[PDB]
């Protein structure tokens, strides 16, 4: 186990110093946006370490 510890994998732009991006807003496809659905395109930004 120990899947509690997450880390952000994809973001639209690099962080400012001491930034805290708590939002799990879905990443941008490059194509037309995905207004709240995962899949092919607009993937989920977080990722569990394991």
């Amino acid at each position, epitope marked *: 186990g120990n899947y509690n510890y997450l880390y952000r994998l994809f973001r639209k732009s690099n962080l400012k110093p001491f930034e805290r991006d708590i939002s799990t807003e879905i990443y941008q496809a490059g194509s037309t946006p995905c207004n709240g659905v995962e*899949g092919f395109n607009c993937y*989920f930004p977080l*990722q569990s370490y394991g």
Partner: antibody
Amino acid sequence: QVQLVQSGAEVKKPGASVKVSCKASGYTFTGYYMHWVRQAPGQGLEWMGWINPNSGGTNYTQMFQGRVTMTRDTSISTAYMEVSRLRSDDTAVYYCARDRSWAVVYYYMDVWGKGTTVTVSS
Amino acid sequence: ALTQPPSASGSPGQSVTISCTGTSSDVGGYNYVSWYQQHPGKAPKLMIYEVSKRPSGVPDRFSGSKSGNTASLTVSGLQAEDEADYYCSSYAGSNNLVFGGGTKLTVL
């Protein structure tokens, strides 16, 4: 080991429900998306949907949205697929599959379970 | 669904091909088309993952590429190891994946 451990075969009364469980092993359970595909013994193969152990989001086809739900269980590194109404048209071997894609949801389905045979009788 | 020819024939050491006639929509411009090799009584494995790419452990005898609307993978120098049916797959828009009907590779 990337072998998926899949639950035993189950027989169900028609119209009722059934749940299928696949236990991941060896690989990292978190990011790797897990699809669910059915193969009727007649012919062909069809795709229902996927669950991801990272976020828990679902998606389905139109043929199964509102008729079948899926869920995860990160404690035992397993994901469950639930069917609400086991119709006689749904006698099939249900396969759980992993994608090559690491944390993205491309449909590159590589390693498959040994086959949980689902039988609907009357 | 994706239409597909039902069968193909050959002999060990020959070269044959298989295809599935999907539309220009949902196959041609909508990439990530993949094929799978399925023996009866056992789980299948991905055999071409991209439109033209082989996963690790794939033998060199297998090759495929989309061609306009249709897609096709051909096998040369076959043996008794390839007596299985072959299913193709495409994204087909908005998380609604579809498989083909499946063609059976036969060897004399």
